[PDB]
Coordinates of C-alpha atoms in Angstrom, one line a residue:
Chain A
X1 CA -11.1 -33.4 30.7
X2 CA -12.0 -36.8 29.3
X3 CA -12.8 -38.6 26.0
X4 CA -16.3 -38.9 24.5
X5 CA -17.7 -42.4 24.8
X6 CA -19.3 -42.1 21.3
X7 CA -16.1 -40.6 19.8
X8 CA -14.0 -43.8 20.5
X9 CA -16.9 -45.9 19.2
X10 CA -17.0 -43.9 16.0
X11 CA -13.3 -44.2 15.6
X12 CA -13.6 -48.0 16.1
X13 CA -16.4 -48.1 13.5
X14 CA -14.5 -46.3 10.8
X15 CA -11.3 -48.2 11.5
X16 CA -13.3 -51.4 10.8
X17 CA -14.6 -49.8 7.6
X18 CA -11.1 -48.9 6.6
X19 CA -9.8 -52.4 7.1
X20 CA -12.7 -54.1 5.3
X21 CA -12.0 -51.8 2.4
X22 CA -8.3 -52.7 2.3
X23 CA -9.5 -56.3 2.0
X24 CA -12.1 -55.5 -0.7
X25 CA -9.7 -53.6 -2.9
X26 CA -6.7 -55.9 -2.4
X27 CA -8.9 -58.8 -3.5
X28 CA -10.5 -56.9 -6.4
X29 CA -7.1 -55.6 -7.7
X30 CA -5.8 -59.2 -8.1
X31 CA -9.0 -61.0 -9.2
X32 CA -8.3 -61.9 -12.9
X33 CA -5.2 -63.3 -14.6
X34 CA -3.4 -62.3 -17.9
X35 CA -4.5 -63.8 -21.2
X36 CA -0.9 -64.5 -21.8
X37 CA 1.3 -62.9 -19.1
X38 CA 4.7 -61.4 -19.3
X39 CA 6.8 -64.6 -19.4
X40 CA 4.7 -66.2 -22.2
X41 CA 5.3 -63.1 -24.4
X42 CA 9.0 -63.0 -23.4
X43 CA 9.4 -66.7 -24.5
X44 CA 7.5 -66.1 -27.8
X45 CA 9.1 -62.7 -28.7
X46 CA 12.1 -63.4 -30.9
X47 CA 15.1 -61.0 -31.2
Chain B
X1 CA -27.1 -13.6 49.4
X2 CA -28.3 -10.1 48.3
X3 CA -25.6 -8.7 46.0
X4 CA -25.0 -5.6 43.9
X5 CA -24.6 -7.8 40.8
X6 CA -22.7 -5.5 38.5
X7 CA -22.2 -5.5 34.7
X8 CA -20.2 -2.3 34.2
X9 CA -19.9 -2.6 30.4
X10 CA -19.5 0.5 28.2
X11 CA -23.1 0.2 26.9
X12 CA -24.8 -2.0 29.5
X13 CA -25.1 -1.9 33.3
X14 CA -27.0 -5.1 34.2
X15 CA -26.9 -4.3 37.9
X16 CA -29.2 -6.0 40.4
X17 CA -29.9 -6.9 44.0
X18 CA -29.9 -10.7 43.3
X19 CA -33.8 -10.3 43.4
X20 CA -35.1 -10.4 39.8
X21 CA -33.7 -7.0 38.8
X22 CA -32.1 -7.6 35.4
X23 CA -31.7 -3.8 35.0
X24 CA -29.8 -2.5 32.0
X25 CA -28.5 1.0 32.5
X26 CA -26.3 3.2 30.3
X27 CA -22.8 2.9 31.7
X28 CA -22.3 6.5 30.3
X29 CA -23.6 10.1 30.5
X30 CA -25.4 12.1 27.9
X31 CA -25.4 15.8 27.0
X32 CA -28.4 16.9 25.0
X33 CA -28.1 20.1 23.0
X34 CA -31.9 20.2 23.2
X35 CA -31.8 19.8 27.0
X36 CA -29.5 22.9 27.4
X37 CA -27.2 21.9 30.3
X38 CA -27.8 18.5 31.8
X39 CA -25.4 15.5 31.9
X40 CA -28.2 13.0 32.1
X41 CA -26.7 10.0 34.0
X42 CA -27.8 6.4 33.5
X43 CA -31.6 6.1 32.9
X44 CA -32.1 9.8 33.1
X45 CA -32.0 9.7 29.3
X46 CA -35.7 8.8 29.6
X47 CA -36.2 12.3 31.0
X48 CA -34.9 13.8 27.8
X49 CA -37.8 14.9 25.6
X50 CA -35.6 14.9 22.5
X51 CA -32.6 12.5 22.5
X52 CA -31.5 13.8 19.1
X53 CA -27.9 14.7 18.7
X54 CA -26.8 13.4 22.1
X55 CA -23.2 13.7 23.0
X56 CA -22.2 10.4 24.6
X57 CA -19.7 10.7 27.5
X58 CA -18.4 7.1 27.8
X59 CA -16.3 5.9 30.8
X60 CA -15.0 3.0 28.6
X61 CA -12.9 3.2 25.5
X62 CA -12.2 -0.1 23.8
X63 CA -13.8 -1.1 27.1
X64 CA -11.3 0.3 29.8
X65 CA -12.9 2.3 32.6
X66 CA -11.5 5.8 32.1
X67 CA -12.3 9.3 33.3
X68 CA -13.9 7.4 36.2
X69 CA -16.2 10.3 36.8
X70 CA -18.9 9.0 34.4
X71 CA -18.8 5.6 36.2
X72 CA -18.8 7.3 39.6
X73 CA -21.9 9.4 38.9
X74 CA -23.5 6.3 37.3
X75 CA -22.7 4.0 40.2
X76 CA -23.8 6.5 42.8
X77 CA -27.0 7.2 41.0
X78 CA -27.6 3.4 40.6
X79 CA -27.2 3.0 44.4
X80 CA -28.6 6.4 45.2
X81 CA -32.0 5.8 46.9
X82 CA -34.1 6.4 43.8
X83 CA -32.7 3.5 41.8
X84 CA -31.3 0.9 44.3
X85 CA -31.7 2.8 47.5
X86 CA -28.8 3.8 49.9
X87 CA -27.9 0.3 50.9
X88 CA -24.1 -0.4 51.2
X89 CA -23.1 -1.4 54.7
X90 CA -23.3 -5.1 54.2
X91 CA -24.8 -5.3 50.7
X92 CA -21.8 -7.0 49.1
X93 CA -21.2 -6.3 45.4
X94 CA -20.3 -8.5 42.5
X95 CA -18.4 -6.9 39.6
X96 CA -17.6 -7.9 36.0
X97 CA -14.2 -7.1 34.4
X98 CA -12.9 -6.9 30.9
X99 CA -11.0 -10.2 30.2
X100 CA -7.6 -8.4 30.6
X101 CA -8.3 -5.2 32.5
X102 CA -5.2 -3.0 32.6
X103 CA -4.5 -3.7 36.3
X104 CA -4.3 -0.1 37.4
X105 CA -7.8 0.7 36.1
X106 CA -9.7 -1.9 38.1
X107 CA -7.1 -2.0 40.8
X108 CA -8.0 1.6 41.5
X109 CA -11.5 0.4 41.2
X110 CA -11.0 -2.3 43.9
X111 CA -9.8 0.5 46.1
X112 CA -12.6 2.9 45.4
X113 CA -15.3 0.3 45.5
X114 CA -14.0 -0.9 48.9
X115 CA -12.8 2.2 50.8
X116 CA -15.3 4.5 49.0
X117 CA -18.4 2.3 49.3
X118 CA -17.4 0.0 52.2
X119 CA -19.5 -3.2 52.1
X120 CA -18.7 -6.9 52.1
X121 CA -17.0 -8.7 49.1
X122 CA -16.8 -7.4 45.6
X123 CA -15.8 -10.8 44.1
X124 CA -14.9 -9.0 40.9
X125 CA -14.9 -11.6 38.1
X126 CA -14.8 -11.5 34.3
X127 CA -18.4 -11.7 32.9
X128 CA -17.3 -14.7 30.9
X129 CA -16.6 -16.7 34.1
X130 CA -20.1 -15.8 35.5
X131 CA -21.8 -17.0 32.3
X132 CA -19.6 -20.1 32.4
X133 CA -20.9 -20.8 35.9
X134 CA -24.5 -20.3 34.7
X135 CA -24.0 -22.6 31.7
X136 CA -22.4 -25.3 33.7
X137 CA -25.2 -25.0 36.1
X138 CA -27.9 -25.6 33.5
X139 CA -25.4 -28.0 31.7
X140 CA -23.9 -30.1 34.5
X141 CA -22.3 -32.8 32.3
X142 CA -20.8 -30.2 29.9
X143 CA -17.1 -29.3 30.4
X144 CA -15.9 -26.3 28.4
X145 CA -18.0 -23.5 26.9
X146 CA -17.1 -20.4 25.0
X147 CA -18.4 -17.2 26.5
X148 CA -18.7 -15.9 23.0
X149 CA -19.0 -12.3 24.1
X150 CA -20.4 -10.8 20.9
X151 CA -20.9 -7.5 22.8
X152 CA -20.6 -3.7 22.6
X153 CA -17.0 -3.3 21.5
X154 CA -15.7 -6.8 22.0
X155 CA -16.0 -10.4 21.0
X156 CA -14.0 -13.1 22.8
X157 CA -13.5 -16.8 22.0
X158 CA -12.6 -18.3 25.3
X159 CA -11.7 -21.7 26.7
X160 CA -13.6 -22.4 29.9
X161 CA -12.7 -25.8 31.3
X162 CA -15.0 -26.0 34.4
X163 CA -14.8 -22.4 35.7
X164 CA -11.3 -22.1 34.3
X165 CA -10.8 -19.4 31.7
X166 CA -7.8 -20.7 29.8
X167 CA -5.9 -17.4 29.3
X168 CA -4.0 -18.9 26.4
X169 CA -6.6 -19.7 23.7
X170 CA -8.8 -16.7 24.3
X171 CA -9.2 -14.7 21.0
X172 CA -10.5 -11.2 21.8
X173 CA -11.1 -10.6 18.1
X174 CA -12.7 -7.1 17.8
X175 CA -15.5 -5.1 16.1
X176 CA -18.5 -5.3 18.3
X177 CA -21.9 -3.7 18.3
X178 CA -20.4 -0.2 18.8
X179 CA -18.4 -0.5 15.6
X180 CA -21.2 -2.0 13.6
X181 CA -23.4 0.9 14.6
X182 CA -20.9 3.6 13.8
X183 CA -20.0 1.9 10.4
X184 CA -23.7 1.9 9.6
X185 CA -24.0 5.6 10.7
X186 CA -21.3 6.5 8.1
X187 CA -22.7 4.2 5.4
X188 CA -26.3 5.5 5.9
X189 CA -25.5 9.2 6.0
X190 CA -22.9 9.2 3.2
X191 CA -25.4 7.2 1.0
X192 CA -28.3 9.4 2.1
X193 CA -29.6 11.6 4.9
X194 CA -26.5 12.9 6.6
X195 CA -27.9 12.1 10.0
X196 CA -24.8 10.6 11.4
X197 CA -25.0 12.4 14.7
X198 CA -28.1 10.9 16.3
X199 CA -26.4 7.5 16.9
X200 CA -29.0 6.0 19.1
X201 CA -31.8 6.3 16.5
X202 CA -29.5 4.8 13.9
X203 CA -28.8 2.2 16.5
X204 CA -32.6 1.5 16.7
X205 CA -32.4 0.7 13.0
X206 CA -29.2 -1.2 13.6
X207 CA -31.1 -3.6 15.8
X208 CA -34.5 -3.1 14.0
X209 CA -33.8 -4.5 10.5
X210 CA -30.2 -5.7 10.5
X211 CA -29.7 -9.4 10.1
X212 CA -27.1 -12.1 9.3
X213 CA -28.0 -13.0 5.7
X214 CA -27.7 -16.8 5.3
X215 CA -26.2 -16.5 1.8
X216 CA -24.4 -13.2 1.7
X217 CA -23.8 -13.3 -2.1
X218 CA -27.3 -14.4 -3.0
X219 CA -28.9 -12.0 -0.5
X220 CA -26.8 -9.2 -2.1
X221 CA -27.9 -10.2 -5.6
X222 CA -31.5 -9.9 -4.6
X223 CA -31.2 -6.8 -2.5
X224 CA -29.4 -5.0 -5.4
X225 CA -32.1 -6.0 -7.8
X226 CA -34.4 -3.4 -9.4
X227 CA -38.2 -3.5 -8.9
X228 CA -40.0 -5.1 -6.0
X229 CA -39.0 -8.4 -4.4
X230 CA -35.2 -8.0 -4.2
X231 CA -35.7 -8.7 -0.4
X232 CA -35.0 -5.0 0.4
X233 CA -38.1 -3.6 2.2
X234 CA -36.8 -1.5 5.1
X235 CA -37.9 2.2 4.6
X236 CA -37.3 2.7 8.3
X237 CA -39.3 5.8 9.0
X238 CA -36.9 7.4 11.5
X239 CA -38.7 9.6 14.1
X240 CA -37.9 13.3 14.4
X241 CA -38.9 13.1 18.1
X242 CA -41.4 15.8 17.5
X243 CA -43.7 13.3 15.8
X244 CA -42.7 9.9 17.4
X245 CA -40.3 8.8 20.1
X246 CA -38.8 5.6 18.6
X247 CA -38.5 4.8 14.9
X248 CA -40.0 1.7 13.3
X249 CA -39.9 -0.3 10.1
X250 CA -42.8 0.5 7.8
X251 CA -44.9 -2.6 6.9
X252 CA -44.1 -3.9 3.4
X253 CA -47.6 -3.3 2.2
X254 CA -47.3 0.5 3.0
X255 CA -43.8 0.9 1.4
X256 CA -43.8 3.4 -1.5
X257 CA -41.2 2.0 -3.9
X258 CA -40.6 5.5 -5.4
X259 CA -39.4 6.6 -2.0
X260 CA -41.6 9.8 -2.2
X261 CA -43.9 9.8 0.9
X262 CA -46.6 12.4 1.4
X263 CA -46.7 12.1 5.2
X264 CA -43.8 14.4 6.0
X265 CA -42.1 11.5 7.8
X266 CA -38.3 11.1 7.6
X267 CA -38.9 8.3 5.2
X268 CA -35.4 7.2 4.1
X269 CA -33.5 3.9 4.6
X270 CA -33.0 1.6 1.7
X271 CA -32.0 -1.8 3.2
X272 CA -29.1 -3.9 1.9
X273 CA -26.7 -2.8 4.6
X274 CA -29.1 -4.7 6.9
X275 CA -27.2 -7.9 6.3
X276 CA -23.8 -6.2 5.5
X277 CA -23.2 -5.0 9.0
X278 CA -23.8 -8.4 10.7
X279 CA -21.9 -9.8 7.7
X280 CA -18.9 -7.7 8.8
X281 CA -19.4 -9.2 12.3
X282 CA -18.9 -12.6 10.6
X283 CA -17.1 -12.1 7.4
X284 CA -14.2 -9.8 8.3
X285 CA -11.5 -7.9 6.3
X286 CA -14.4 -6.1 4.5
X287 CA -14.4 -3.1 6.9
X288 CA -10.6 -3.3 6.9
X289 CA -9.9 -5.3 10.1
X290 CA -7.6 -8.2 9.8
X291 CA -9.0 -10.3 12.6
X292 CA -11.1 -13.4 11.6
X293 CA -14.8 -13.7 12.3
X294 CA -16.0 -15.2 15.5
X295 CA -16.5 -18.7 13.9
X296 CA -12.9 -18.8 12.8
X297 CA -11.7 -17.8 16.3
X298 CA -14.0 -20.4 17.9
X299 CA -12.4 -23.2 15.8
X300 CA -8.9 -21.7 16.5
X301 CA -9.5 -21.9 20.3
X302 CA -10.9 -25.4 20.0
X303 CA -7.6 -26.5 18.4
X304 CA -5.8 -25.6 21.6
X305 CA -3.8 -28.2 23.6
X306 CA -6.3 -30.6 25.1
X307 CA -7.1 -32.7 22.0
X308 CA -9.7 -34.6 24.1
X309 CA -11.1 -31.3 25.2
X310 CA -11.8 -29.8 21.7
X311 CA -14.8 -32.1 21.1
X312 CA -16.5 -30.9 24.3
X313 CA -15.3 -27.4 23.4
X314 CA -17.5 -27.0 20.4
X315 CA -20.2 -29.3 21.9
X316 CA -20.5 -26.4 24.4
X317 CA -20.5 -23.3 22.2
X318 CA -22.4 -20.5 23.9
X319 CA -23.1 -17.5 21.7
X320 CA -23.6 -14.8 24.4
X321 CA -23.3 -11.0 24.4
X322 CA -25.4 -8.5 22.6
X323 CA -24.4 -8.9 18.9
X324 CA -25.5 -12.5 19.1
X325 CA -29.1 -11.1 19.0
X326 CA -28.6 -10.4 15.3
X327 CA -31.1 -12.6 13.4
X328 CA -29.3 -15.6 11.9
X329 CA -26.3 -15.1 14.2
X330 CA -26.8 -18.5 15.9
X331 CA -27.4 -20.5 12.7
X332 CA -24.7 -18.7 10.7
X333 CA -22.1 -19.2 13.5
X334 CA -22.9 -22.8 13.8
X335 CA -22.8 -23.4 10.0
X336 CA -19.3 -21.9 9.8
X337 CA -17.8 -23.6 12.9
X338 CA -19.3 -26.9 12.0
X339 CA -17.8 -26.7 8.5
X340 CA -14.5 -25.9 10.2
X341 CA -14.8 -28.6 13.0
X342 CA -13.6 -32.2 12.4
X343 CA -16.5 -34.2 11.0
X344 CA -16.5 -36.8 13.7
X345 CA -16.1 -34.2 16.4
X346 CA -19.7 -33.0 17.0
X347 CA -20.4 -29.3 17.1
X348 CA -23.1 -27.9 19.3
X349 CA -23.8 -24.1 18.8
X350 CA -26.4 -22.8 21.2
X351 CA -27.4 -19.3 22.4
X352 CA -28.7 -18.1 25.7
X353 CA -32.4 -17.0 25.8
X354 CA -31.2 -13.5 26.6
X355 CA -27.4 -13.4 26.0
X356 CA -27.5 -9.9 27.4
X357 CA -28.7 -10.7 30.9
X358 CA -27.2 -14.2 31.0
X359 CA -24.2 -12.9 32.9
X360 CA -26.3 -11.3 35.6
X361 CA -28.4 -14.5 36.0
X362 CA -25.2 -16.5 36.4
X363 CA -23.7 -14.0 38.9
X364 CA -26.9 -14.0 40.8
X365 CA -26.9 -17.8 41.1
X366 CA -23.2 -17.7 42.1
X367 CA -24.1 -15.2 44.9
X368 CA -26.8 -17.6 46.1
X369 CA -24.5 -20.5 45.7
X370 CA -22.1 -21.2 48.5
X371 CA -18.3 -21.3 48.0
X372 CA -18.8 -17.5 47.5
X373 CA -19.2 -16.6 51.1
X374 CA -16.0 -18.7 50.9
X375 CA -13.4 -17.6 48.6
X376 CA -14.4 -14.0 48.5
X377 CA -12.6 -10.7 49.5
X378 CA -13.6 -7.3 50.9
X379 CA -12.5 -4.3 52.8
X380 CA -12.4 -6.6 55.9
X381 CA -9.6 -8.5 54.3
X382 CA -8.6 -5.6 52.1
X383 CA -7.8 -3.9 55.4
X384 CA -4.7 -6.3 55.7
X385 CA -3.3 -7.4 52.3
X386 CA -4.0 -4.2 50.4
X387 CA -4.9 -5.3 46.9
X388 CA -2.7 -8.4 47.0
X389 CA -5.6 -10.4 48.6
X390 CA -7.9 -9.1 45.8
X391 CA -5.8 -10.2 42.8
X392 CA -4.9 -13.4 44.7
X393 CA -8.6 -14.2 44.6
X394 CA -9.1 -12.6 41.2
Chain C
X1 CA -26.5 33.5 -17.5
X2 CA -23.0 32.2 -17.1
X3 CA -21.8 28.7 -16.2
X4 CA -20.9 30.2 -12.8
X5 CA -18.0 27.9 -11.8
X6 CA -15.0 29.3 -13.7
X7 CA -14.7 31.9 -10.9
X8 CA -14.0 29.2 -8.3
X9 CA -12.2 26.8 -10.6
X10 CA -11.5 24.5 -7.7
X11 CA -9.6 21.5 -9.1
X12 CA -8.1 22.7 -12.4
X13 CA -6.0 19.5 -12.6
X14 CA -3.2 20.5 -14.9
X15 CA -0.8 19.8 -12.0
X16 CA -2.6 17.0 -10.3
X17 CA 0.3 15.2 -8.7
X18 CA -1.3 11.9 -7.6
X19 CA -1.1 10.7 -4.0
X20 CA 0.0 7.0 -3.7
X21 CA 1.7 4.1 -1.9
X22 CA 2.3 5.2 1.7
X23 CA -0.4 7.8 1.4
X24 CA -2.9 5.1 0.6
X25 CA -1.8 3.4 3.8
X26 CA -2.4 6.7 5.7
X27 CA -5.9 6.8 4.3
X28 CA -6.5 3.2 5.2
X29 CA -5.2 3.8 8.6
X30 CA -7.2 6.9 9.0
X31 CA -10.4 5.1 8.0
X32 CA -9.7 2.3 10.4
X33 CA -9.2 4.6 13.3
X34 CA -12.3 6.5 12.3
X35 CA -14.3 3.3 12.4
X36 CA -12.6 2.7 15.7
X37 CA -13.2 6.3 16.8
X38 CA -15.9 7.6 19.1
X39 CA -18.8 10.0 19.5
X40 CA -17.2 13.2 18.1
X41 CA -17.5 13.1 14.3
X42 CA -10.3 9.1 27.3
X43 CA -8.5 7.6 24.3
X44 CA -5.1 9.1 25.2
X45 CA -5.6 7.5 28.7
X46 CA -6.5 4.2 27.0
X47 CA -3.3 4.3 24.9
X48 CA -1.2 5.2 28.0
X49 CA -2.5 2.4 30.2
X50 CA -2.2 0.1 27.1
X51 CA 1.5 1.0 26.8
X52 CA 1.8 0.2 30.5
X53 CA 0.3 -3.2 29.5
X54 CA 3.1 -4.2 27.0
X55 CA 4.6 -7.6 27.7
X56 CA 5.3 -10.9 26.1
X57 CA 3.0 -12.9 28.3
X58 CA -0.7 -13.5 27.6
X59 CA -2.2 -10.1 27.7
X60 CA -4.1 -7.5 25.7
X61 CA -1.4 -7.0 23.0
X62 CA -0.6 -10.7 22.6
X63 CA -4.3 -11.6 22.3
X64 CA -4.6 -10.5 18.6
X65 CA -5.5 -13.2 16.1
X66 CA -3.7 -11.8 13.1
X67 CA -4.2 -12.1 9.3
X68 CA -7.0 -14.3 8.0
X69 CA -6.7 -17.4 5.8
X70 CA -9.8 -16.5 3.8
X71 CA -8.6 -13.7 1.5
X72 CA -9.9 -10.2 1.5
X73 CA -13.1 -9.6 -0.6
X74 CA -13.7 -6.5 -2.7
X75 CA -16.5 -4.1 -1.9
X76 CA -17.6 -0.9 -3.6
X77 CA -17.5 1.7 -0.7
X78 CA -20.1 3.9 -2.4
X79 CA -22.9 1.4 -2.3
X80 CA -21.1 -1.4 -0.6
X81 CA -21.7 -4.1 -3.3
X82 CA -19.0 -6.4 -4.6
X83 CA -16.6 -4.4 -6.7
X84 CA -14.6 -5.7 -9.7
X85 CA -12.5 -2.4 -10.0
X86 CA -9.9 -0.4 -8.1
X87 CA -9.3 3.3 -8.3
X88 CA -5.9 3.8 -10.0
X89 CA -4.8 6.7 -7.7
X90 CA -5.9 5.9 -4.1
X91 CA -6.6 2.1 -4.5
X92 CA -10.2 2.2 -3.1
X93 CA -12.6 -0.1 -4.9
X94 CA -15.8 0.5 -6.8
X95 CA -18.2 -1.4 -9.2
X96 CA -19.4 1.0 -11.9
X97 CA -18.5 4.0 -14.0
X98 CA -21.1 6.0 -12.0
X99 CA -19.5 5.0 -8.8
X100 CA -16.0 6.0 -10.1
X101 CA -17.5 9.3 -11.0
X102 CA -18.9 10.0 -7.5
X103 CA -15.6 8.7 -6.0
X104 CA -13.5 11.0 -8.2
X105 CA -15.7 13.9 -7.3
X106 CA -15.8 13.4 -3.5
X107 CA -13.3 10.9 -2.1
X108 CA -10.4 10.6 -4.6
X109 CA -7.4 12.7 -3.5
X110 CA -9.5 15.2 -1.6
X111 CA -9.1 13.8 2.0
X112 CA -5.4 12.9 2.0
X113 CA -4.1 15.9 3.9
Chain D
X1 CA -14.3 -34.8 -2.2
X2 CA -13.9 -31.4 -0.6
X3 CA -11.7 -28.4 -0.5
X4 CA -8.2 -29.6 0.2
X5 CA -7.0 -27.9 3.4
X6 CA -3.5 -29.4 3.5
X7 CA -1.2 -31.9 1.8
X8 CA 1.8 -33.4 3.5
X9 CA 3.8 -36.4 2.0
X10 CA 5.5 -38.4 4.7
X11 CA 10.5 -42.6 -0.6
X12 CA 7.1 -41.1 0.2
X13 CA 5.4 -43.5 2.7
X14 CA 2.0 -42.0 2.2
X15 CA 0.4 -38.6 1.9
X16 CA -1.9 -37.0 4.5
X17 CA -4.6 -34.8 2.9
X18 CA -7.2 -32.7 4.6
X19 CA -10.6 -32.3 2.9
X20 CA -13.4 -29.9 3.9
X21 CA -17.1 -29.8 3.0
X22 CA -20.1 -28.0 4.4
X23 CA -20.5 -30.9 6.9
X24 CA -16.9 -30.6 8.4
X25 CA -13.3 -31.6 7.8
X26 CA -11.6 -35.0 7.6
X27 CA -8.0 -36.0 7.5
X28 CA -7.3 -38.7 4.9
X29 CA -4.3 -41.0 4.6
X30 CA -3.6 -41.6 0.9
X31 CA -1.6 -44.4 -0.8
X32 CA 1.7 -42.9 -2.0
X33 CA 1.1 -43.9 -5.6
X34 CA -1.9 -41.5 -5.5
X35 CA 0.6 -38.8 -4.7
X36 CA 1.7 -38.8 -8.3
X37 CA -1.8 -37.9 -9.5
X38 CA -2.1 -35.0 -7.1
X39 CA 1.1 -33.4 -8.6
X40 CA -0.1 -34.2 -12.2
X41 CA -3.3 -32.3 -11.5
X42 CA -1.5 -29.4 -9.8
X43 CA -3.7 -29.6 -6.7
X44 CA -2.8 -27.3 -3.9
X45 CA -4.6 -26.2 -0.7
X46 CA -7.8 -24.4 -1.5
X47 CA -8.6 -26.5 -4.5
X48 CA -11.7 -28.8 -4.7
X49 CA -10.9 -32.4 -5.7
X50 CA -12.7 -35.8 -6.1
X51 CA -10.1 -38.4 -5.1
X52 CA -11.8 -41.7 -5.8
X53 CA -11.2 -44.4 -3.2
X54 CA -10.9 -47.6 -5.3

């Protein structure tokens, strides 16, 4: 047999969706910085 | 050209002359206690004034031509002169075969058919292949369709890649119309009216009210619900053959909820099982069988080898056979297979206008079609390579 | 007049001796073949030519699907409705006290011979 | 969301999970960290789950 012309188009479509969502989430999961951050607290925290 | 298009199935005999014949005949004989001594062959059942309590003499068991005498009488009669005239000489014949006929059975057939009727090719071919030819005819672009043979005592999920029955992913399942009917017979009589002998009348009911409930659980709930509504509404007034000839469903407006009719009619039947029987056809393991409903087997087939094929596979689903007539069959079958098929992969479940004659229509076209005078096989060639030529072609 | 059944005293179950395990299977098997059975309420020839057909290649015997993924559902067998219960002796299922009564009187232990 | 038809983790590089609904089946690739949650919820094939994408 063969491959459906629409099937490959749909696979391309949802691959594009997948990659754009990797971008969206990888940006959104690193969008804001700590108020202090680990090394500030390490510097301040005494024995 | 003109061909004795044959459909020798246990319950149906869609034999024709390639000229708009579509003639269903009983591939069986009948003995009627009422009709003293008469083995009514084929349509001679219409001669029986009272078809009550008929003893069915079946040439097929699990669909495997046996006793041969029933089928002989039938065939002869069919040809005869009264049904299809005495026309053999050149009137080549086309024959259907169970998917995996047990060689010897239809090998002996081949012999008899040739050197006992003697007339141009038999071109014996599984009904599924003929229906596949017909489908591909009306569906040129399409590639692989299931001959979903929801028939008498059979139901096959079958790969058909362009007139190529893949004898690897074919699920013969089981539990066809025959079973359904018998199961009802028991259920009906044991529940009420121990009439489980008439068969054919119960069969009337079996294809008079029975249906594929869309939501089995919900439908159940309603049917088993006191008072009116509750779907129910069958009260199939079975005929005693002294009053009427075929039974019928009483109109809902005339149904007496108390079940006590004054008319003297055999006024039983209580519904519910209406959807249960077809449900068994779909939802298995209820009766006791372990095979999976045709939807499951469909998907199973689709998941075969040719990953590119599978998409076309369900995009060409062809619910053929008898059982397919069951109301809701098409929609139910689709629903299940679709919920089982890969989302992206599109599922197309269709059903022939008459999934009973579809085979005969196909075979007729094939007869008219060329590459059938080519290919082929008859006594002419059977006179040299025994049956080897036959099996080589089929 | 009299209660008119102490004369026949059919069951008198002081010695009942339940039928179980493999016997259940027998019943199941019987029912299956009865649902697979025919007019009378050639099969030997069918079995013979089927035992001619035994092989490992794609054929009648090797075309069986097998067990289902979707598990078996309970049904009542007296009225066919979904059945929460099982009969302790024979294992057949039912949905009410009434249905158990009928089953005990007609189908429990009586057709196991 | 759907009925989970299969789970196969592939040290786990990812987990493939099959989900079924009334409109068909889809095979998902899932971040391996998510594979902890699945075991915490005791999901196994035949369960209905709502794995949230983000």
